[PDB]
Design a protein around this ligand. Structure first.
Ligand SMILES: [Zn+2]
Length: 257
């Protein structure tokens, strides 16, 4: 099955998932000079005060912090979005070295990692239905650079020892995703896809301009995770990012000048 190795990584995905070569694939390089300031964009609204985290799961390609999305407790709206999108999970993509790991790039620069907060459009009633729609998801992307610690990430880092291998889950309640956000909500936005199979073209990407900084120890702990299940041969969960895909017939919009 698909993965990030030599024989099953991104360049192979198209064989099972032909949309890999589609017209609105993600991620992309964000050419900051070619992005268009868009005045019709409304302010972005991130309402996470009532978020209910439930669990953390190693799914064999990343770890997801999952939320209760059975009510409007943690929602994204505004910006380029019509309507209300509920937070279902967040996860990261990261590198084996600090010089790579992000999926999106900014003027070809790679960050050490990238946080994805995955939301679905409440008009479609659940995540499974939403991913089948062209406006089904909104993913808020935040770049991580290595420097000072991010205190708000530490609770995540500390539980990773409990979900080292594929299939492991652990209770993860009362985590506040507001501690992972940078000061500024300035963003680029464009229409794209899931960056993991099934690669469905259902995502409005909202990528924040301002990275968060995390410590070297914090990202090191990500790199101790395993793609494999317990008792299978150990392969460190690193470089779980898809490279930048062709922009094709798309223009990236910016909320700022
Ligand atoms: Zn992702």
């Amino acid at each position: 099955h698909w993965g990030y190795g030599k024989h099953n990584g991104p360049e192979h995905w198209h064989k099972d998932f032909p949309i890999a070569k589609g017209e609105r694939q993600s991620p992309v390089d964000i050419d900051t000079h070619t992005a268009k300031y868009d005045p019709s964009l409304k302010p972005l609204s991130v309402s996470y005060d009532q978020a209910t985290s439930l669990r953390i799961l190693n799914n064999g390609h990343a770890f997801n912090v999952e939320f209760d999305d059975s009510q409007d407790k943690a929602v994204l709206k505004g910006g380029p979005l019509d309507g209300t999108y509920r937070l279902i999970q967040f996860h990261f993509h990261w590198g084996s070295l600090d010089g790579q790991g992000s999926e999106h790039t900014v003027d070809k620069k790679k960050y050490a990692a990238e946080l994805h907060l995955v939301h679905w459009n409440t008009k479609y009633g659940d995540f499974g239905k939403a991913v089948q729609q062209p406006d089904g998801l909104a993913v808020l992307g935040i770049f991580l650079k290595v420097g000072s610690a991010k205190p708000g990430l530490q609770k995540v880092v500390d539980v990773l020892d409990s979900i080292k291998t594929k299939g492991k889950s652990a209770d993860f309640t009362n985590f506040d995703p507001r501690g992972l956000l940078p000061e500024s909500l300035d963003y680029w936005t464009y229409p794209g896809s899931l960056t993991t199979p099934p690669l469905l073209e259902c995502v409005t990407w909202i990528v924040l301009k301002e990275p968060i900084s995390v410590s070297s120890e914090q990202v090191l702990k990500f790199r101790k995770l395993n793609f494999n299940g317990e008792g299978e041969p150990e392969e460190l969960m690193v470089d779980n990012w898809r490279p930048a895909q062709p922009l094709k017939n798309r223009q990236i919009k910016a909320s700022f000048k």
